[PDB]
Design an enzyme around this catalytic site. Sequence first.
Site, PDB file in Angstrom:
ATOM      1  N   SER A  60     -21.790  51.714  18.386  1.00 23.28           N
ATOM      2  CA  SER A  60     -21.162  50.386  18.411  1.00 23.28           C
ATOM      3  C   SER A  60     -21.271  49.739  17.032  1.00 23.28           C
ATOM      4  O   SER A  60     -20.755  50.318  16.059  1.00 23.28           O
ATOM      5  CB  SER A  60     -21.757  49.587  19.568  1.00 23.28           C
ATOM      6  OG  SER A  60     -20.764  48.701  20.061  1.00 23.28           O
ATOM      7  N   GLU A 108     -15.022  52.165  27.936  1.00 23.88           N
ATOM      8  CA  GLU A 108     -15.668  51.312  26.949  1.00 23.88           C
ATOM      9  C   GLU A 108     -15.593  49.838  27.332  1.00 23.88           C
ATOM     10  O   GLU A 108     -16.451  49.057  26.917  1.00 23.88           O
ATOM     11  CB  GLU A 108     -15.022  51.531  25.581  1.00 23.88           C
ATOM     12  CG  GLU A 108     -15.195  52.938  25.035  1.00 23.88           C
ATOM     13  CD  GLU A 108     -16.540  53.156  24.339  1.00 23.88           C
ATOM     14  OE1 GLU A 108     -17.444  52.303  24.468  1.00 23.88           O
ATOM     15  OE2 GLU A 108     -16.691  54.197  23.657  1.00 23.88           O
ATOM     16  N   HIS A 119     -19.928  51.793  27.759  1.00 28.06           N
ATOM     17  CA  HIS A 119     -20.326  51.556  26.372  1.00 28.06           C
ATOM     18  C   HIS A 119     -21.843  51.652  26.217  1.00 28.06           C
ATOM     19  O   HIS A 119     -22.602  50.919  26.867  1.00 28.06           O
ATOM     20  CB  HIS A 119     -19.825  50.165  25.942  1.00 28.06           C
ATOM     21  CG  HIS A 119     -19.898  49.897  24.470  1.00 28.06           C
ATOM     22  ND1 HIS A 119     -19.156  50.598  23.546  1.00 28.06           N
ATOM     23  CD2 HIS A 119     -20.604  48.978  23.768  1.00 28.06           C
ATOM     24  CE1 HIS A 119     -19.403  50.125  22.337  1.00 28.06           C
ATOM     25  NE2 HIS A 119     -20.270  49.135  22.446  1.00 28.06           N
TER      26      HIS A 119
END
Lengths: 532, 532
Positions: free
Chosen positions: B197, B324, B437
């Site tokens: 990320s 995600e 995610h």
Amino acid sequence: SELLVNTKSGKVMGTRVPVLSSHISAFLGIPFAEPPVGNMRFRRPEPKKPWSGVWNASTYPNNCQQYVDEQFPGFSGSEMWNPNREMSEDCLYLNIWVPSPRPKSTTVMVWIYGGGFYSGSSTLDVYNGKYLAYTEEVVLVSLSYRVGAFGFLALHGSQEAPGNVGLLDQRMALQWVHDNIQFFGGDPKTVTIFGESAGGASVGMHILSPGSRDLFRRAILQSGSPNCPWASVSVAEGRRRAVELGRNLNCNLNSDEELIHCLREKKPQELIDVEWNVLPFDSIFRFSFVPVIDGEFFPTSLESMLNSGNFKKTQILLGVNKDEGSFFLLYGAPGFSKDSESKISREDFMSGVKLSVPHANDLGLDAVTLQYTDWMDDNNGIKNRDGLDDIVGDHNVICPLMHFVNKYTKFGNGTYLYFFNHRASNLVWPEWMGVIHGYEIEFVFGLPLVKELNYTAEEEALSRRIMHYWATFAKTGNPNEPHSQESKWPLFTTKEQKFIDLNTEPMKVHQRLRVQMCVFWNQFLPKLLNAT
Amino acid sequence: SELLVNTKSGKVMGTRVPVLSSHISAFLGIPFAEPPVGNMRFRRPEPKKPWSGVWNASTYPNNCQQYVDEQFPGFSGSEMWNPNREMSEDCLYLNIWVPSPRPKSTTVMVWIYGGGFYSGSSTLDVYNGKYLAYTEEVVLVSLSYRVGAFGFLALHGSQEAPGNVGLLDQRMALQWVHDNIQFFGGDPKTVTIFGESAGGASVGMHILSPGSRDLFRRAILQSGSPNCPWASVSVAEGRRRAVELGRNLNCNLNSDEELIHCLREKKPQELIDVEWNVLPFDSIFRFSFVPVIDGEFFPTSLESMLNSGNFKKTQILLGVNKDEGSFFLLYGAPGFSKDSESKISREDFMSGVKLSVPHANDLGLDAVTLQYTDWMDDNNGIKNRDGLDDIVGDHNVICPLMHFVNKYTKFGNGTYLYFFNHRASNLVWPEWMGVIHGYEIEFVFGLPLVKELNYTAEEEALSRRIMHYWATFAKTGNPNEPHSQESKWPLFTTKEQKFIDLNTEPMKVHQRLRVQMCVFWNQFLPKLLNAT
Ligand SMILES: *[C@@H]1O[C@H](CO[C@@H]2O[C@@H](C)[C@@H](O)[C@@H](O)[C@@H]2O)[C@@H](O)[C@H](O)[C@H]1NC(C)=O
Ligand SMILES: *[C@@H]1O[C@H](CO[C@@H]2O[C@@H](C)[C@@H](O)[C@@H](O)[C@@H]2O)[C@@H](O)[C@H](O)[C@H]1NC(C)=O
Ligand SMILES: *[C@@H]1O[C@H](CO)[C@@H](O)[C@H](O)[C@H]1NC(C)=O
Ligand SMILES: *[C@@H]1O[C@H](CO)[C@@H](O)[C@H](O)[C@H]1NC(C)=O
Ligand SMILES: *[C@@H]1O[C@H](CO)[C@@H](O)[C@H](O)[C@H]1NC(C)=O
Ligand SMILES: *[C@@H]1O[C@H](CO)[C@@H](O)[C@H](O)[C@H]1NC(C)=O
Ligand SMILES: [Mg+2]
Ligand SMILES: [Mg+2]
Ligand SMILES: [Mg+2]
Ligand SMILES: [Mg+2]
Ligand SMILES: [Mg+2]
Ligand SMILES: [Mg+2]
Ligand SMILES: [Mg+2]
Ligand SMILES: [Mg+2]
Ligand SMILES: [Zn+2]
Ligand SMILES: [Zn+2]
């Protein structure tokens, strides 16, 4: 100039050959010894006098003089092992496969063909080194050596037929590879010798022989070991057979000189035609002219060398096939047939036991019979058939090899043991024969990668795995990927004695290959025969 | 002395920690910068003054000051990402895992945590480097960097709060690893930076920034890229947000000096409590204080750097997860629930689109809506839910990353792309969220090897495969075994654009990851917004 190479004995020009949608260089039929002809028959090899000009090395050489198997005419399963070039005493040549482009200094593998020390050819389809050199980027050599009387007539104390000269042929090829393989992109410091049946025994014999040990790095033995009962004779027995050969040919037997003069006067086929007459017994898996325990090539008995650590200490990879006996029963024991499932009667079982252990007295034959008979079901012809297969395979291949691996592993630097038990989908032999002596060779050499040979996708995968095990072992001393998630082939250790199956199914590990039967053949039966 | 190491800044003593029935050495909480406290808040980092005596490095350091997620109190799925040590502005420390025995000079991997540039901790359970250093024999480093206003307050043209200092914190740790990792058995010439990320965006930003490029060899980017819409702001927008932060705290806004004096006077939590107020829009997947495109750390626009090849040219491995968007919808979009399958009404779908593309005008919102609506079934709440997941994931992670990979691959030295789509058997989040995610991180770091975490045998195998891909790539630039029979992860090429799925099933290769939607987000929507 890729195909032109200068060697210490002269120039040689090879040829580009296709393989698997690519190409490599082949150097076929390079001489490494003077032709052992005329008055050099039976003599130790002499190295090849250097030549002027360029040696044409684009075609396979002659094969050595040998008995030809005509038992099954027109049948590919047998004829593919016969010589496929003209036979000649002028036969000491070697072949080299080099990847393209030519590597700088890469791993070398030298193949020693089997065939019981009486037959064999470097030029067989199943020994085509191009698939292995290509797929694994190794320099692949196949050598040749005299067989039959031409390679192993032993009149110990004679200098004209001293015995073991076929092994000396193999050593001279190994010497040539040592002195010359660099010029082909081969690393002479990383040579692996490998061979099947008598070739595997040969490999073991170079591990034992002081004069051979420096000429290679590591070794692979397939269905053969140096202590196999058929792979050597005593100095006395070798002499007895040499005399008997001359007796069969109406020779002067008064002295070695007069006997050898006679035998050198005979045409090669006159020697071949009486070769089997010199065996002491009606037998199977016994061959007339084999290495002799002479106190020179072998300083002492094989057992004493194995016990005392008197051998090259390195890494070895070796193994056997599931049904080693079937080929020999088919050819030589009563009741067996290529055309039927070969259920064996009690009477034929008894005859087969005696052919299989020809040196045993009646008590020894009773012991073998008891060990391999299911007395809850003694007339089961299928069990009798399979029992003979086990007797022949255990006695002649599997238990000698296990004896060798257990003795070797006490002093060596690492041992990897396999049990090959995959029956090829396209096998031309009947089902009862199973996984036959010699039928792993086509997987070692990569034939299942060839679409027109009609193997399955699983068999192609198995062949790639095997070639990779073999070539990774030649290069490192360990068949295993250095850091891979695929299952490891464990070292064979004195204490746990692990080995793997080689087949299309997920790898399984086992311990103590046929330990029960091998105690019988390696410890008990010898003791019984020595007592009685 | 394994646990005592002399570095250019002083001595440090670590600790032996168990792992997977063995042990390794850990050096936890090593300082690499002066504590950025008092009048150094917002300033560039200064390197750590060398210390006398021995630094005790047996326990994790403080975590940086940050917003703490209390949305789901007592729920491990959220709380495991919160700081697990005391928070402090004194937080610039790094951690090192070294195998035992200590290698001579081995591969180094430096982890950069994510968390949107507003949160994150080197000390999280899922970042425990011991399983990776141990299983793969690498020196594993985790660094830290200021987040939120403390790391990214940008008053461009000020020298006291110039922006990007959290990235400079990361660079100073990379500089320290460069100058000192040898003393730990690490090879400073073979350092891979990897992160997920905002950590993955960071990694991309060090690829772009001239001042960072020499401090590593290769890079791994997980669900993040430097061109992500949330990962940078303009110099003007960064200044607007810095002013707005002071407006929220009743600061003098007359000049940078007076604004910064005020902001340096506030307690850390006073800044954190108003942090989200400075965002320009009601939004999801947008964060207040992030890297600024300043003409210094980034010489020109990211797009112009990517087009002109103005970045470090090396090998990269990167990828995304299947779902995600789900984390961000759960937290911020109407209709989503941890306690239900979250079927999304048409009205809530429209609200979610606007939160997800907060910068779009009404025409742009109509284009997104049309692109992701099945007008044969527009009231299907499941399709609406999954559509928002795709909108959020495609816009914020997947299509920016594909833009980066296609631009990078034109100049780089090799690209490996993955699609992680395995849903963990023990996931604590509901089924509708899918492959969330951040939930590949536990596989990269080896948590499924720990029996008490209750993963399956297949998941342990997947984690070992992944760690091995990652560490083999760090060491060689290629995730692949040099000569293995297992299926290869193919290079991603401009022409064929191949990538692999990462999951428990046999490896499948695909091409043009979400190419249709990424043409929409990367080409068409930008053009539409620029026209209208
Ligand atoms: C090299 O040899 C090639 C193949 O040759 C065959 O084997 C030799 C030993 C002769 O018996 C020949 O009659 C056979 O056809 C030839 O095609 C090639 O031209 C040869 N090259 C040279 C330079 O002689
Ligand atoms: C090194 O640190 C070990 C663990 O310490 C804890 O952290 C430090 C910073 C102190 O706050 C201490 O009170 C905590 O318990 C100690 O167990 C160990 O004895 C320390 N070694 C030395 C030489 O001080
Ligand atoms: C082989 O020899 C090397 C060198 O002495 C030794 O380190 C290694 O452990 C040996 N391996 C085996 C299996 O004997
Ligand atoms: C393999 O099978 C094909 C028929 O599909 C046949 O034409 C070919 O001769 C076979 N190859 C053999 C038997 O070696
Ligand atoms: C990476 O760079 C080396 C050195 O120039 C080159 O040989 C190699 O082909 C390159 N590989 C790729 C995938 O660009
Ligand atoms: C794993 O399962 C066992 C029950 O078999 C349980 O005691 C343990 O707490 C579980 N670990 C977790 C939930 O992390
Ligand atoms: Mg004469
Ligand atoms: Mg059998
Ligand atoms: Mg291979
Ligand atoms: Mg590996
Ligand atoms: Mg003040
Ligand atoms: Mg989804
Ligand atoms: Mg590994
Ligand atoms: Mg390999
Ligand atoms: Zn005569
Ligand atoms: Zn004040």
